[PDB]
């Protein structure tokens, strides 16, 4: 699951050649943060 840039769409592409957003044109993707528990010491 990857988030695009100016366009809002889930890429979810894992192929080596798939780097371009679908129906967007731009090739900038951001990795989405999943629901994982992380512990911090205050």
């Amino acid at each position: 699951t990857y988030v695009c840039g100016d366009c809002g769409q889930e890429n979810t592409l894992k192929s080596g050649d798939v780097i371009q957003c679908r129906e967007c044109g731009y090739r900038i993707l951001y990795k989405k943060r999943t629901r994982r528990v992380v512990q911090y010491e205050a």
Partner: protein
Amino acid sequence: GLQNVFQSFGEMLVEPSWRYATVKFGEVTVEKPTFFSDDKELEFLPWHARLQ
């Protein structure tokens, strides 16, 4: 700036040693930056160039 640079340079005749070839330069025009994508033309921004 660019117009004066191109106007100052004068191209003379080209002869290998009748036929001869001479070139000339007209008005210089500069277009806005544009990203040449595979699908279609897209807007180009400084942060797009920084990330790519």
